Amino acid sequence: VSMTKTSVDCTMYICGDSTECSNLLLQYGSFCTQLNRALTGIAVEQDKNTQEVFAQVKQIYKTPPIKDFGGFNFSQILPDPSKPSKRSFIEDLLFNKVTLQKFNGLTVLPPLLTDEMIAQYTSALLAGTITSGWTFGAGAALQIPFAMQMAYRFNGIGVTQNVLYENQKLIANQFNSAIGKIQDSLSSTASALGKLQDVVNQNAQALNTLVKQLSSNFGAISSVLNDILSRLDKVEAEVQIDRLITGRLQSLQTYVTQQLIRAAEIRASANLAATKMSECVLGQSKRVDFCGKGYHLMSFPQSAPHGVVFLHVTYV
């Protein structure tokens, strides 16, 4: 749904504790401001993306104090109030199964929405989902009993609604056991989170690569700036310095171009995730292979670090 936000001081990356390096950087004009702008145009897009994926309701719906959902035991995915975090149990796995510089002018400022706020939006999306059916996605949240919501779902997949009621104990049991297979699978392997652990590793390795380039000679006799300004004269050290300005500026331009290209793929991912939120959570999609595999009944959104995770519920 997002990458990390980032800002770099182009001056503290290229230079640092050297005024004559800045007096050389200014000889290249506006590039540094354009770079900072460019990363700001990514960073703004990260909070926009997160807000379009999760903020699809203008009301928080609290889940009701009594859990009479006809036998569907949502307690694995509803928030637990008894804990310090207001995350669900399943999403408190997701928050751990993904795992995770200021000296060089790089700054990794926080998102707009906090994780405890995203947890509240995914709570309201789920709580509306089990108490209201889909109606809150179009108008007001209108209550209906969950076994009648599922009857409507069944009608949606073209299966006549007696088929729910004649089998309700079985259908809830199958469902409840299936929410168990999710829980245990997420407890078993990292290989499920790989789409997120990838985009976290890749944005980390991008910053770590931009930092190591500070040590590159680029054909100057040393990358340590104080060597160049101490050991050599003002007019030939200027020639050794323009090598470092030029190599480091190309390095930052490589990072900024790479981040824009990435942020274009994260956007596409966020616009998909926002579309799956609207059409799979706030509704029942008729589209084959869109809300998972089978015929679609409903889905439940969860938070994950920089991402959204859908439990798609389907009839097979």
Binding site: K58, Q59, Y61, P64, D68, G70, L112
Partner: protein
């Protein structure tokens, strides 16, 4: 008498859905809504 205020962001209007195992809220009137959407 104006000044800048800084606050934790309200997620929305907080609400509780009046759920029971036998209760339903069939709507009885409607408003046709026209909403603008803008794309480049």
């Amino acid at each position: 008498s104006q000044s800048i205020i800084a606050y934790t962001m309200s997620l929305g209007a907080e609400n509780s859905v009046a759920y029971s195992n036998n209760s339903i809220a069939i709507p009885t009137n409607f408003t046709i809504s026209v909403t603008t959407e803008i794309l480049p």
